[PDB]
């Protein structure tokens, strides 16, 4: 028989399997982009809907 989910019944349980990152995930460099705004404002095609 398959194990009853712990939240399904009213007993407390103090040994449980927590998933974890192996190390801090904010450690890396932040993303950065190269925005390059349009050559001529009058030439911009805002149409097409």
């Amino acid at each position: 028989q398959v194990g009853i989910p712990k939240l399904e019944v009213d007993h407390i349980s103090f040994s449980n399997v927590v998933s974890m990152m192996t190390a801090n995930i904010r450690t890396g460099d932040d993303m950065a982009v190269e925005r390059v705004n349009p050559d001529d404002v009058r030439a911009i095609n805002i149409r097409n809907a």
């Binding site: 190269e34 390059v36 349009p38 050559d39």
Partner: protein, 49 residues
Amino acid sequence: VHMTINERAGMSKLVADNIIASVIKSNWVVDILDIEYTAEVMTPSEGYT
């Protein structure tokens, strides 16, 4: 590759260096149509000023 470039606007600088490198390294021909220029025809004694 014989690449034609009608625009240059919005192009990443990194992509431009990559293309010029493709000229130097993969023998790309790269026709940029947007450019306008005056020219001078120097004599060999004169050199490239």
